[PDB]
Amino acid sequence: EKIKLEHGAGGEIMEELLRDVILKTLTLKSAGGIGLDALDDGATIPFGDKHIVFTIDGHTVKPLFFPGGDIGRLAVSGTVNDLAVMGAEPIALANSMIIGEGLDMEVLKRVLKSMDETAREVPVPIVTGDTKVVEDKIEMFVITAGIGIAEHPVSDAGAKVGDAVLVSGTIGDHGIALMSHREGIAFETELKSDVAPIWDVVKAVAETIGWENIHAMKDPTRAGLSNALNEIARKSNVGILVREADIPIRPEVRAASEMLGISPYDVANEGKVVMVVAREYAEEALEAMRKTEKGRNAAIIGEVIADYRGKVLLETGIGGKRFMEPPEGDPVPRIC
Amino acid sequence: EKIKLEHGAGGEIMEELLRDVILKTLTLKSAGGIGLDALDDGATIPFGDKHIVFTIDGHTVKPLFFPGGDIGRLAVSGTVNDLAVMGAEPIALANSMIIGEGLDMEVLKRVLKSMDETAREVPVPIVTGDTKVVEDKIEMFVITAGIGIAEHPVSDAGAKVGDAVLVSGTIGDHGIALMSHREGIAFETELKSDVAPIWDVVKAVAETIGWENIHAMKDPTRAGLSNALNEIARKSNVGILVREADIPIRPEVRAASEMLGISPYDVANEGKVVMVVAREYAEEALEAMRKTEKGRNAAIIGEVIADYRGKVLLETGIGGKRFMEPPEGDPVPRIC
Ligand SMILES: Nc1ncnc2c1ncn2[C@@H]1O[C@H](COP(=O)(O)O)[C@@H](O)[C@H]1O
Ligand SMILES: Nc1ncnc2c1ncn2[C@@H]1O[C@H](COP(=O)(O)O)[C@@H](O)[C@H]1O
Ligand SMILES: [Mg+2]
Ligand SMILES: [Mg+2]
Numbered sequence: 001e002k003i004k005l006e007h008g009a010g011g012e013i014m015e016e017l018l019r020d021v022i023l024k025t026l027t028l029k030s031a032g033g034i035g036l037d038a039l040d041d042g043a044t045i046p047f048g049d050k051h052i053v054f055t056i057d058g059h060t061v062k063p064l065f066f067p068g069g070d071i072g073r074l075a076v077s078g079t080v081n082d083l084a085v086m087g088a089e090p091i092a093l094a095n096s097m098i099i100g101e102g103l104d105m106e107v108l109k110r111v112l113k114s115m116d117e118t119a120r121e122v123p124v125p126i127v128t129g130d131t132k133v134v135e136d137k138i139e140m141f142v143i144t145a146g147i148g149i150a151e152h153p154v155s156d157a158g159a160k161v162g163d164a165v166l167v168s169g170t171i172g173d174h175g176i177a178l179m180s181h182r183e184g185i186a187f188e189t190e191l192k193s194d195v196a197p198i199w200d201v202v203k204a205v206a207e208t209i210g211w212e213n214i215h216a217m218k219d220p221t222r223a224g225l226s227n228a229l230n231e232i233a234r235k236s237n238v239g240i241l242v243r244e245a246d247i248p249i250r251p252e253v254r255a256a257s258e259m260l261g262i263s264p265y266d267v268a269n270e271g272k273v274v275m276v277v278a279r280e281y282a283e284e285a286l287e288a289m290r291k292t293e294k295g296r297n298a299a300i301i302g303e304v305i306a307d308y309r310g311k312v313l314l315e316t317g318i319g320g321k322r323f324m325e326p327p328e329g330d331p332v333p334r335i336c
Numbered sequence: 337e338k339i340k341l342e343h344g345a346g347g348e349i350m351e352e353l354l355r356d357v358i359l360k361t362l363t364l365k366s367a368g369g370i371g372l373d374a375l376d377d378g379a380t381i382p383f384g385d386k387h388i389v390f391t392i393d394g395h396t397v398k399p400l401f402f403p404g405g406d407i408g409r410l411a412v413s414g415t416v417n418d419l420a421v422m423g424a425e426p427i428a429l430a431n432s433m434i435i436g437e438g439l440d441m442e443v444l445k446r447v448l449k450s451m452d453e454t455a456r457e458v459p460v461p462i463v464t465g466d467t468k469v470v471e472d473k474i475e476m477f478v479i480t481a482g483i484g485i486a487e488h489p490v491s492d493a494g495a496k497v498g499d500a501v502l503v504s505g506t507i508g509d510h511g512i513a514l515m516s517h518r519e520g521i522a523f524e525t526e527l528k529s530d531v532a533p534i535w536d537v538v539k540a541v542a543e544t545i546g547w548e549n550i551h552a553m554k555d556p557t558r559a560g561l562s563n564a565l566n567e568i569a570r571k572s573n574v575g576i577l578v579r580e581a582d583i584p585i586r587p588e589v590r591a592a593s594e595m596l597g598i599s600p601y602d603v604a605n606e607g608k609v610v611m612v613v614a615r616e617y618a619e620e621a622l623e624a625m626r627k628t629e630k631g632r633n634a635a636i637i638g639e640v641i642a643d644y645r646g647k648v649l650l651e652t653g654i655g656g657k658r659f660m661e662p663p664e665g666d667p668v669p670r671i672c
């Protein structure tokens with residue numbers, strides 16, 4: 001048996017590798033809180049009356065620079081966002097770079113400048129790192145780890161019947177922008193990735209409704225909104241019912257996805273959060289998001305239900321329903 | 337200007353890249369304690385009456401499996417050792433893997449099993465991670481980040497005049513074993529790498545003499561003992577005088593290094609610590625190390641002096657001296 005691209009594509013095939021190989025081989029997997037077996041956006045460690053949150057993400061996107069961002073902005077944003085969806089204020093990043101021999105020094109400078117600018121938006125410092133140079137023709141991979149502090153960690157398994165399901169903005173932007181750029185599809189301007197740190201959106205909600213009323217979150221990166229909703233449903237052992245008409249999609253992203261023959265629900269987002277909140281605070285949560293710049297297009301898209309446990313239903317027309325199936329993997333190669 | 341292999345070789349050429357490009361481009365570099373500008377083995381963050389210590393290391397060693405270890409054992413050991421030389425008890429690791437499409441699943445299983453076994457020696461859990469699969473023919477890169485807790489962080493800049501300089505064991509084992517394996521040099525058995533987690537050696541000393549009497553430590557990985565001593569001298573603004581005869585070198589490593597035409601002082605070690613301790617506790621520190629299995633061959637090799645600030649002197653014969661020059665880089669390609 002050989003490793004396939006699908007094993008790193010963030011969908012069901014990767015999930016099989018994680019459960020059958022990684023989780024079964026590693027034995028020490030928790031430091032006292034959320035650990036590897038939870039397969040959440042990060043891990044947690046009790047520390048005093050708070051929790052340290054710990055995450056890591058590798059980035060192998062091609063091309064390194066794309067409309068709306070680059071591998072540097074992606075590296076900072078992805079790690080900040082993984083901490084944010086665990087309920088953690090980011091406190092430090094670590095930056096590993098693996099660089100192909102012969103890369104232009106100016107490329108490395110541009111990547112670092114983008115990391116710096118993106119980190120300053122949070123704000124969060126890059127406090128340690130590592131650099132390796134290899135003969136392989138890879139251009140550059142960037143791997144960032146993050147530490148945050150959470151007073152009240154939020155899992156992807158805490159959804160309750162009756163809760164509202166929100167997204168902080170338009171869906172499909174990153175994956176579709178990257179595929180569109182590769183295919184030469186563009187409108188009045190090129191479609192831009194949404195890549196950005198969204199700790200401010202999560203914090204805004206928590207400051208309004210309290211951490212206890214945010215029941216679950218996921219960062220809908222690899223394999224998209226569909227993967228994220230399916231994971232929350234499965235891990236929380238609940239059903240999720242979403243109204244297709246209420247899911248925000250940028251008009252240009254809708255058009256490009258049709259041309260590409262790919263669903264915007266199935267591709268990576270890099271500046272969005274999926275959030276599940278107590279029914280009675282759903283409108284307060286939505287208003288808090290829409291007050292921020294990065295959450296300006298937020299919407300309530302669904303609700304958690306008692307039946308169809310572990311499944312996600314899409315409602316269309318005047319009430320008809322079908323399953324929103326978990327992707328086998330992200331249909332976009334080298335997307336992040 | 338292009339990125340060269342030397343830029344990742346852990347010596348003076350890498351130091352130039354760090355100071356002229358990375359440190360000058362990144363602006364947010366500290367979370368309140370030791371930060372990026374210190375260029376130490378890790379960073380520190382005040383937390384209550386203790387300090388969180390944070391480190392990251394990428395591993396691109398070839399071949400993946402070598403005498404005495406593999407990339408999995410290297411990934412766990414290197415990160416644990418970086419935390420240990422900051423004075424930190426390891427509490428959690430994060431595991432990023434980037435895998436070449438087509439790698440045998442059995443190779444991935446073997447690597448993970450080695451990580452598991454090595455982590456269990458510490459003991460320290462692997463609590464989060466990431467997997468990417470790329471088309472590039474890289475086999476596998478492993479990037480690990482670590483979190484530890486230190487009551488009293490130890491810098492590489494705290495050496496004082498009169499202090500003793502110790503190493504926890506034989507010097508040059510890893511780099512020379514890897515080069516010997518590539519060249520087909522072997523004795524009754526193949527030379528083994530020393531790769532191993534050495535938190536127990538550091539802890540043993542601290543439990544004996546107290547953290548306050550350990551003034552500096554470095555993990556002598558890339559560019560070897562020579563690089564580590566030069567960095568401590570330069571950052572502490574002191575001279576270091578070492579007696580060549582007192583530096584422990586395995587007889588087989590000495591022989592192989594001669595055949596290879598490479599100094600054992602200039603190549604990576606993966607199971608060793610360089611430690612600088614208060615003069616009056618040097619013998620207690622040495623005894624504490626030699627009581628452990630991994631520190632069994634520890635030696636006092638030198639002392640910190642007031643002149644030749646920023647330099648390292650090697651004493652030979654009956655008193656003659658020359659400089660131990662900082663390497664331009666590790667003379668071993670793809671060593672870690
Ligand atoms: N190579 C790996 N080692 C350990 N844990 C992993 C690895 N790859 C993924 N994970 C975990 O699997 C889940 C999904 O990974 P990600 O694709 O980073 O969201 C997260 O909980 C990760 O911590
Ligand atoms: N790409 C990078 N980004 C940020 N810091 C780095 C990078 N590479 C190395 N460093 C820092 O430079 C020092 C030496 O790196 P290392 O070779 O990992 O010992 C350490 O303090 C690292 O944290
Ligand atoms: Mg995530
Ligand atoms: Mg180090």
